[PDB]
Each structure stands twice: as structure tokens, then as C-alpha cells.
Design a protein around this ligand. Structure first.
Ligand SMILES: O=P(O)(O)O[C@H]1[C@H](OP(=O)(O)O)[C@@H](OP(=O)(O)O)[C@H](OP(=O)(O)O)[C@@H](OP(=O)(O)O)[C@H]1OP(=O)(O)O
Lengths: 131, 24, 60, 101, 142, 34, 279, 99, 121
């Protein structure tokens, strides 16, 4: 079956999931592990045989597996992943813009620099033209 | 987030490099 | 015209990433899809014999 | 300012001070610039896309074949599983008929 | 290109080529001959790697001739390349290891002279190293 | 697992093809009837 | 193991290198626990020029023996391999990774080979750095071997002072030196020991230039010397003159007068008299 | 790992299993089913939202993009054409059930 | 209630706050921000996904919703372009301002040196 056991690593034909693990095991593996060690191999929580449920597929009403690759969930998923990328991109651009826009406002000395040049050159002229 | 399957590229590259290679 | 400029930019980034990884991911996709086909043909063959076995038990 | 300032007559100006027909020419050329930037991108995109189409087309053709095969098999499983369950139920009905005859 | 009885016969021909070019003052050609003579074959460079022409680069006579021309006509950095390659290939004798260090020391590259002595000691096994250690330890103290 | 030497070490710069890339009849009868 | 070698040698005598490779790869599945089998394989891959396989063989060796239970013999062999392949920045990397991740009771092989690799293929600032770190480790060992090997302390202290090492570490090692109080009431054994204290005060006064701490050093001398059974006039004279420096003769007189008080000794009188003459 | 929902037949990023059936579901779908019908969708056993065991193992990997899926408007175009085929399928089912 | 994500500025269905700054986020963006940048996005301090506190908590037509996406996507991309355009304009203003500043320093340097000559006329 398509289920792969977490512990043996094989594609199982006796799929069982345990409530504490949230994980998939072979029946033939987990019963002896419970018998010899009483413990979930994954979480190291306790186990008992009532905590185990066996998986099935292909019952009545069970929808056909979509294999066409496109789907509404997967398109909405990747449209969401586009949106997250563009917002975090736009956020860093907005941060970059704020930094640049902040410092060029603080850097607005240039008219006061011009008055200092006027003050310096007029002093220079009066100091140059006294002889 | 999209091409997270690159983990499977390196794993299959790693497994391929276990051919003609040592124990464990 | 501003909106289409960014769609084309994101398209380029997608296409460039797609050029790095599409060939691998499509190959990986087929390798999963192949397994489903063989496993489905296993189920098909297994159920055919069971239908045939019922014809056997009926004739017998 | 980033909306008010546009170049016209080969110089940067306020938009509102220009003659109306000069505003139309400015906005036309402003638009034509953006259409240039789009086309410069679209050609680059189509170039990479055209490469991808042939690079991936074989893998896609394989997937198309597998989808058709998988649909055929799963519909055969469906009909065969229907046949199993009727003949199993019919086998019980025939067993009663044996005792009757 | 021709055959010879052994490596030492061929090495004399290479030296005789550079020798005449040097006497005719074609010093850059003489170095070019030695470069062309000393280049280590790659594993595919010859019909077999045990032919005389494929082994001639291991002859110490040839490397001695090459390194001496670099001292006379080359740059200090180019001489280190020759000597370092000569050390790398096991070619360098203890004496010409001490020539290498003498060359660096004479050019006041004292600290590189000690690396020259140091790899001299890495190659050779006693008593061969004994005069390398003698010259090293007195020079370091001095 | 620990931080690998696979990860910590510089990549080898002396890479070379031969160093690290060169790694590791009968008859038949004619068919049935023919 | 000797059986598999004869099968390897069998295949090599027919120049069946890929066969001999496959025997090694099976051989390490059985006798992989012996590191030398793992090094021999990588020497074999190297000697046949499969240097990419030799590198991978050493990297798999590290993986096999575990990168927490790190093995020096793989590190040394791997590092010397990369050195011999002129991957010197990797060779240096492997040695440094070894020293960074192993306790210094091992690593003596990693050190000696690292101060071979660096001593050739390194450079002066690197060569001296590794030799100092070797020597510090070497003194630290021979101190743990004995503690009362005062000449190991006097070297170790001199080394750390000479290399201008940070005050806290030079001060700390002095405290470890000082704890080795001679187990004897006889001045002969103290005559060598006492210069640990004197040098500590001289370091604190001249190099650290923290005179309050230097005072605490000198004070702690006088709390340790028995005084009733013997005395060192050396420490009393130095501690007196240390308080003549900083312009505190009212303390120097108190220090030197207590020396006369506890233990009249001719050099103590002479030195105090000479001080009062100079004043 | 990879899983498919018994209700939708799509891959699921949140696989869950009922305690009263072997079949596995996308959590938000089975919860919405339970919120209407209070029952297992396949076994028809009575079912409650706390009788659900969750597979913490990683869900199915993303479907690779089509080359036409590399642009946002063409994803929306693809989503439109996908959606129309899904509705025609749902409409075909109710016709087939009548027949 | 209405909650606004600090990253996107949009109303969020899953408001979460970080203890390192106290700003509300959409869980999905801040996890991706953390997974890419490591910091808090507003205070720039170190942040980690366990430091995030969750806050307390119709359909019309599919052809319409698809057109609302189309128009809304064009607005998001329009914004992103104008940010890139505005950011280059800010850098162009900035670099010009530095040139005026550096030219003014050269003028003030030039004149201040020339002003020394008046003491030795
Ligand atoms: O106390 P004194 O009879 O005057 O002898 C002292 C004294 O010798 P001892 O205490 O060992 O008998 C000194 O020793 P310390 O008190 O400093 O421990 C010693 O100094 P050294 O131990 O360093 O030899 C010094 O000798 P020197 O004059 O060479 O400093 C010497 O003094 P006199 O020679 O003046 O007697």
C-alpha cells in the first residue's frame, strides 16, 4: 500500500496509526514493540492496544484520487505563496524607502551650507580688499 | 516554500553517491 | 502598465527558478505517479482473480 | 511630486502648467515608455519559456500518458469491484436455488 | 623525440640544448627548454608512462640545471616554484635543499628558508637529514 | 547529528576530472516455423 | 582481517582495481571497527589516483565512527591526506576542527602533526601561534603531573607574560601556581617557591599597573610565610619599598617595623636603616 | 509523506483519520461534514470531532507549476478553467444519479 | 474584531503578537519573516516562533470572486512597482544631496584656505 512505515521504512500492507504518535506503523511491528517495551518508538510516550487504528481506502463514496496535477486547493495554495512573497518583498522595500527617505530629510542642510558660503566669501572679500 | 523538494534532490544525490561506497 | 511590469518581473523570477528545478520536480512527480499506476494495476489484477474465484465456487 | 512631475519638451516640468495638447503628448510618451519596459521583459520571458517548453515537454508527455492509464485502471477496478459484489450476492441466491430445485 | 638507452643520456641532451642557448644569450629560450623538459607528464601524455621520455622529468640533473638558470636569470618567486616542485616530486637531494635555503637566505627571505629546511626534514630519513638539521639549527640560532 | 566536516570544511579547490570525477556474441536461430 | 587482505592482494596482482575496491567495501562491512582498515582503503584509493573516492572514504570514516565520539586517527590521516593533495586550507581545517572538538589529553598527535603542517605550509604568525598553544598545553599537562614542578610554572608564567596574554588569564594561572605551597617548614624548599609570589607582585605592579591588587599580593605573602620558623627578608624589603613608591612611608615604616617585631634579621635591619638614611 | 482525502480526492496538508473508520480526510472537510451530519461519511458510524486522530507527519508536497502557471494572471486564468471543469463534473454527477 | 497585520497592513484572519515588540501580525507572514530574517520586523530584536502569542478571535459569485482577485492582484503589484520606483527616486534624491554636500565641503575648504592669505597680504 502507499503507506510507508515510520520504523521499518517499508511500504506497508498493514497500516496502523497510534493516537499518541500521530505516526504510521506496521501492525506486526507495533504489537511486539508494545509487548516488549510498552512505548511509542517516536515520542517515547506510553502505548496500549486500544490506542491503535488501522487505515483503509477505497470504501463506498471514496472520491477518485485527482492525478491531473492542477487542483483548486493547489492553485489557491500557490496564489497564497505568491501573496506572502510579494508582501514581505513590499515590506522590505517599504523599510528601505523609509530609511532612505528619513536620512535625506535629515540631510537637508544645503540652504544653510549656502549661507555659510555667503558668510565666508563676504568675509574673504572684506579681508582681501583692505589694502 | 515552493521548491522545498530540493531536499529530495540532495537525498537522491546522496543515495546515488552511496553506490560503490562504504558501510553506514 | 505599472501592474503588468511587476507581473512580468515575478514571471521572470518564477521562470528562472523553474529553469533550475522543474526538470527535477517533474521527474520526481513521474516517479511517484508511476508507483500509483503499478500499485493500481496490482489492485486490478488482485480483484480480477477474486471475481474469477467466485465464478469457480459457483461452477463447483 | 512623483505624480506631478513629468518631462516635456526635453525638460522636467510641472504637469499642470503645460498646454493641454502638450500634456497629452507627454502622457502618451510616458505611457509608451512603460510599454517599452513591458516588451523588453516579455521578450526575455518568452525566450526562457520557449526553452522550458521543449526541455520539459517530454516529462509532461509522460505524465499525460500516465494519467490516461491510471484513469483506465481505476475505472476498471470500480467496475470489477461492482461485479465482485453482485456475483458474491448472486452466489448466495443461487445456493438457495440449489436447495429449492 | 628519439629513443635513448636511459634517462641520464636524454637528460644530458636537454641540458646540452639549454646550455647552447644560454651561451648564445637566448636565456628566455633556455628557460623555455627547461620548462618544456621538466613538465611532469599527466597519466595520458605518453604511450606508456615508463618510457624514457616519460621518466626524464625525475632526473635530478635536469632540475638542478633548471633551478640554477632561474637563480641566474629569473625572479625569486619563480625560483621558489622550481625548488618547491623539485621538493614535491622527491627529486631534491639534501644538498640542493640546502641550496634552496641558501638562496632564500641570501635574498633575506629567512623565514621561507626555514620552510625550505623544514620540508627537507619531512622528506628524508636519518642519517640523510643530519646535515639538514645541522645547518637549520645553527642558522636559526644565528 | 553533529555539524559535519562535510559542511565545515572548505570545498576542495584542487578538483580535477581524473582525480575526483573519474570515480566508480552468438548466433540466434530463425524464428518459429520460418 | 588477514584473509581479506590476501583476496585484495590477489585481485591487485591481476590489476583488477575495481574488484579490489569491492573487497574493501565488503571488508569494512565486517571489520570496519578497526580504523586501520578504513585508512588502508583510503590509502588504496589515493594510491590508485581515485582521490575523490579517497576523500569520500575519509569523510565516511568520520561519519562511521561518529562526529561526537571523534577519532583522532581519522582526523590526522584525513588531514595529512589533504595536505598531501595540496588541499592545505582543508588540512588546516581538519586539524583545527580536531583541536576544537577533542579534550587535550588526546590531541597530542593532532597537535604534533598540526605543528608539522603549519610549520611547513603555514606562515610565521601561524607557526608561532600553534607552537605557543602547544607549549601552553604542554606546561598545563606537566603541571597536572606534579603541581610542585615550579620550573613549569616559571616557564608558563613567563610564556603567558611574553605573549602579552590577557591579564585575567595571567592572573588566574598565578593563583594556581600559588596554591602549591611547599609541604615543609624548612626554608630550603621555599627559596625557589617564593619567586612565584614575587613575580606575581612584579607583574601586578609593572604590567597590570593595578597597585591595589599588587598590595594584596604582597600582603598574602606575609600571611603564608611561617615567620616564627624562618622568614624571607626579600618580601619584607620589597613590600616596604612598594609603599615607599606611592609615597606612603607611614605604611612602609609600619610594614618594616613589624618585620623587626616578628623576626629580627640582619638584612631587615640593614635595609630599614638604609631606607631611613636615604630619607 | 503523501496522503489523499477520501472526501475530495485531493492531496491534503492536514491529514486526519476518524477513530470509527480506516479512511483519512482533510480536517476542515470532515469537520464540516460532521457539523452537518454527525457521522462518518463512509462507514455512517456516529462520529464527533474529538474522535479524530491527527497525522503529524509532513503532508503531501506541492504540485509543480505548469509553465503557464508561472504568472499570476495565468494562474487566475488556469483557476477559472479548473473551476469550470469542477462545476461541470459536479453537474454531471447529479445528472448521472438521476439516470 | 478587526486586527491589522504589521507587515501587510491588511485585516488578518489570524492575528498573532510577538512578545519581543508587541506588534500584531498575520501568523503566516511573521513565521515566514522569522524563517527568513530571524528578527522581529519592527524592533529588530531576536525573535523565534515560540515567542508568538495568539490573540483571541460569505460568498457571492465565483466569476465575481475571480474578478475581485484579478483587480486586487493588480493593486498589490501596482503598489510593489511604485515602491521600487519611489525607492530609486529616494536614492536619486539622496545621492544628489550628498553631492551637493561634498561640493559644499570642497567650496568651504577652498575658501577657508584662501582666507588664510588675507593674514599675510
Ligand atoms: O639574614 P642574613 O644573615 O643577613 O643573610 C641574608 C639572608 O640570608 P638567609 O636568610 O638565607 O640566612 C638573605 O636571605 P633572605 O632573608 O632574603 O631569604 C640572603 O638573601 P638570599 O636568600 O637571596 O641569598 C642575603 O644574601 P644577599 O646579601 O646576597 O642578598 C643575606 O644577606 P647578607 O649576605 O648581607 O648576610
Amino acid at each position: 500500500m502507499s503507506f510507508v512505515c515510520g520504523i521499518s521504512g517499508e511500504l506497508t500492507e498493514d497500516p496502523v496509526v497510534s493516537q499518541v504518535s500521530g505516526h504510521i506503523f506496521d501492525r506486526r511491528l507495533i504489537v511486539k514493540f508494545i509487548a516488549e517495551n510498552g512505548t511509542d518508538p517516536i515520542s517515547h510516550g506510553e502505548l496500549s492496544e486500544d490506542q491503535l487504528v488501522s487505515l483503509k481506502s477505497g470504501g463506498t463514496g471514496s472520491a477518485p484520487r485527482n492525478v491531473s496535477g492542477t487542483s483548486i486547493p493547489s492553485l489557491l495554495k500557490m496564489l497564497q505563496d505568491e501573496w506572502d512573497t510579494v508582501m514581505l518583498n513590499s515590506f522590505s522595500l517599504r523599510q528601505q524607502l523609509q530609511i532612505a527617505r528619513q536620512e535625506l530629510s535629515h540631510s537637508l542642510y544645503q540652504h544653510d551650507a549656502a549661507c555659510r558660503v555667503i558668510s565666508r566669501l563676504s568675509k574673504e572679500l572684506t579681508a582681501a580688499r583692505e589694502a | 516554500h515552493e521548491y522545498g523538494n530540493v531536499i529530495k534532490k540532495v537525498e537522491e544525490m546522496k543515495v546515488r553517491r552511496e553506490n560503490e561506497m562504504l558501510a553506514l | 502598465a505599472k501592474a503588468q511590469n511587476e507581473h512580468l518581473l515575478m514571471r521572470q523570477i518564477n521562470l528562472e527558478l523553474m529553469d533550475e528545478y522543474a526538470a527535477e520536480s517533474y521527474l520526481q512527480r513521474n516517479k511517484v505517479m508511476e508507483d500509483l499506476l503499478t500499485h493500481a494495476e496490482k489492485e486490478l489484477r488482485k480483484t480480477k482473480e477474486a471475481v474469477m474465484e467466485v465464478h469457480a465456487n459457483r461452477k463447483m | 511630486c512623483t505624480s506631478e512631475i513629468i518631462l516635456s519638451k526635453d525638460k522636467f516640468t510641472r504637469i499642470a502648467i503645460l498646454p493641454r495638447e502638450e500634456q497629452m503628448k507627454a502622457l502618451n510618451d510616458e505611457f509608451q515608455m512603460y510599454r517599452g519596459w513591458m516588451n523588453q521583459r516579455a521578450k526575455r520571458a518568452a525566450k526562457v519559456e520557449k526553452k522550458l517548453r521543449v526541455k520539459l515537454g517530454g516529462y509532461q508527455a509522460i505524465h499525460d500518458k500516465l494519467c490516461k492509464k491510471y484513469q483506465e485502471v481505476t475505472t476498471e477496478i470500480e467496475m470489477a469491484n461492482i461485479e465482485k459484489k453482485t456475483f458474491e450476492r448472486l452466489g448466495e441466491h443461487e445456493l438457495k436455488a440449489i436447495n429449492k430445485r | 623525440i628519439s629513443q635513448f638507452g636511459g634517462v641520464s643520456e636524454l637528460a644530458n641532451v636537454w641540458c646540452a640544448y639549454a646550455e647552447m642557448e644560454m651561451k648564445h644569450k637566448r636565456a628566455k629560450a633556455a628557460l623555455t627548454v627547461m620548462q618544456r623538459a621538466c613538465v611532469v607528464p599527466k597519466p595520458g601524455d605518453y604511450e606508456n608512462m615508463q618510457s624514457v621520455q616519460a621518466r626524464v622529468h625525475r632526473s635530478p640533473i635536469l632540475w638542478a640545471m633548471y633551478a640554477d638558470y632561474e637563480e641566474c636569470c629569473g625572479t625569486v618567486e619563480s625560483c621558489r616554484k622550481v625548488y618547491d616542485k623539485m621538493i614535491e616530486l622527491r627529486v631534491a637531494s639534501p644538498q640542493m635543499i640546502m641550496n634552496y635555503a641558501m638562496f632564500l637566505e641570501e635574498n633575506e627571505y629567512f623565514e621561507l628558508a626555514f620552510q625550505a629546511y623544514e620540508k627537507g626534514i619531512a622528506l628524508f630519513k636519518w642519517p640523510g637529514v643530519f646535515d639538514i638539521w645541522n645547518t637549520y639549527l645553527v642558522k636559526f640560532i644565528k | 547529528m553533529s555539524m559535519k566536516l562535510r559542511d565545515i570544511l572548505p570545498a576542495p579547490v584542487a578538483a580535477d576530472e581524473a582525480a575526483s570525477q573519474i570515480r566508480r556474441v552468438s548466433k540466434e536461430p530463425p524464428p518459429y516455423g520460418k | 582481517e588477514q584473509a581479506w587482505q590476501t583476496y585484495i592482494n590477489f585481485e591487485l596482482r591481476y590489476k583488477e582495481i575495481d574488484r579490489a575496491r569491492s573487497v574493501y567495501q565488503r571488508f569494512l562491512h565486517v571489520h570496519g571497527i578497526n580504523v586501520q582498515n578504513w585508512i588502508k582503503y583510503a590509502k588504496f584509493e589515493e594510491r590508485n589516483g581515485y582521490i575523490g573516492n579517497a576523500r569520500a572514504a575519509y569523510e565516511k570514516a568520520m561519519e562511521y565512527f561518529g562526529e561526537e565520539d571523534i577519532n583522532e586517527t581519522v582526523l590526522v590521516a584525513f588531514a595529512l591526506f589533504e595536505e598531501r593533495q595540496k588541499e592545505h586550507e582543508r588540512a588546516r581545517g581538519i586539524f583545527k576542527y580536531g583541536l576544537d572538538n577533542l579534550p587535550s589529553n588526546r590531541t597530542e598527535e593532532i597537535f604534533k602533526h598540526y605543528t608539522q603542517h603549519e610549520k611547513k605550509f603555514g606562515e610565521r604568525v601561524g607557526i608561532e601561534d600553534v607552537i605557543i598553544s602547544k607549549r601552553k598545553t604542554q606546561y598545563e599537562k606537566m603541571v597536572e603531573e606534579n603541581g610542585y614542578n615550579y620550573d613549569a610554572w616559571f616557564d608558563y608564567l613567563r610564556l603567558l607574560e611574553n605573549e602579552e596574554t590577557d591579564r585575567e588569564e595571567v592572573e588566574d594561572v598565578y593563583e594556581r601556581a600559588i596554591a602549591n605551597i611547599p609541604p615543609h617548614s624548612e626554608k630550603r624548599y621555599w627559596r625557589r617557591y617564593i619567586y612565584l609570589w614575587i613575580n606575581y607582585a612584579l607583574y601586578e605592579e609593572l604590567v597590570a599597573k593595578d597597585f591595589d591588587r599588587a598590595r594584596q599580593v604582597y600582603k598574602a605573602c606575609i600571611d603564608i610565610i611561617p615567620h616564627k620558623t624562618f622568614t624571607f627578608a626579600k618580601v619584607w624589603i620589597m613590600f616596604a619599598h612598594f609603599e615607599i613608591r606611592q609615597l606612603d612611608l607611614n605604611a612602609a615604616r609600619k610594614i618594616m617595623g613589624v618585620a623587626i617585631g616578628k623576626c629580627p634579621k640582619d638584612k631587615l635591619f640593614r635595609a630599614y636603616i638604609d631606607l631611613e638614611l636615604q630619607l
